[PDB]
Amino acid sequence: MTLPSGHPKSRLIKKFTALGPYIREGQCEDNRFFFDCLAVCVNVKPAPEKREFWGWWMELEAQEKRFTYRYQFGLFDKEGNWTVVPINETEVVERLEYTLREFHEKLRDLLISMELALEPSDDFNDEPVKLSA
16 A cells, blocks of 8 residues: 555555554555554553553654654554543653654654655644743
């Protein structure tokens, strides 16, 4: 299943794998790359699979001759379904803000290897998250 970007989905998935965990490549009507990152677990007393974990998903859309991503926060359930919930304990929210930037740092390097244009998220209007909170 190749993407409209022009590049092979086999190479993109394999390459993106070097920026984190194994990407879930399969069949889907929409052409987007969604990754599940784990920052901090909700609880520790109970089991891991029995509890959910915190982590913002990164969904980017490969353009014609460039790449673009966006910042989207949420939660990584065990069912692998879309679930948006509030972040408890500011201590954790701070961890996401840090990893958020570091995520783009490694993502930029990869795109640089393919010489793909990079741009900010249209959802942002000169109002980046407070990294120094």
